[PDB]
Design a protein around this ligand. Structure first.
Ligand SMILES: *[Se]c1ccccc1C(=O)Nc1ccccc1
Length: 164
């Protein structure tokens, strides 16, 4: 069974609700396992308490920098970075979960929820899951973004974990 995980998200302390994600461990087991463990916090670090630090309406929500909270940090459960597992899953449309990176083989903990179908990102970012429930929460996060990515409220993953 592919893991189901959740992120409960706040905007300036007001609960926005829950995003439920399926991690495609059947396709990208190593990338799925990293995200799953960062959600449970079982390695002693992870996403709880961290933020969506970059949000661009009509494009994406970006999160996972739980060390520096600004896009420069994060780390994987394996070490600071780990390779691109494969590019089998594509950026097919809204709700896609994709690893952020700084070029080939630099996956860490940062990730995007992508709202756009684009062949240009295929083969550059590892896709590893999708939104099962809560796309309305994603659009509320989106509502607090801006062209630059700066958010107008502090968007916080107040709790996260594994459902199954
Ligand atoms: Se969508 C997506 C998925 C994976 C990586 C990056 C993106 C993305 O939309 N990036 C971006 C879009 C618009 C402006 C800045 C950055």
């Amino acid at each position: 069974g592919n893991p189901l995980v959740y992120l409960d998200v706040d905007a300036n302390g007001k609960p926005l609700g829950r995003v439920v994600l399926e991690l495609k461990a059947d396709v990208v087991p190593k990338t799925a396992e990293n995200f799953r463990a960062l959600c449970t916090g079982e390695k002693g670090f992870g996403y709880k308490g961290s933020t969506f630090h970059r949000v661009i309406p009509s494009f994406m929500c970006q999160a996972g920098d739980f060390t520096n909270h600004n896009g420069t940090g994060g780390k994987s459960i394996y070490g600071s970075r780990f390779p691109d597992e494969n590019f089998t899953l594509k950026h097919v449309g809204p709700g896609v979960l994709s690893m952020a990176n700084a070029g080939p083989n630099t996956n860490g903990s940062q990730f995007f929820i992508c709202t756009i179908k684009t062949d240009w990102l295929d083969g550059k970012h590892v896709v590893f899951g999708h939104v099962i429930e809560g796309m309305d929460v994603v659009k509320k996060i989106e509502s607090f973004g801006s062209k630059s990515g700066r958010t107008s409220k502090k968007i916080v993953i107040t709790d996260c974990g594994q459902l199954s």
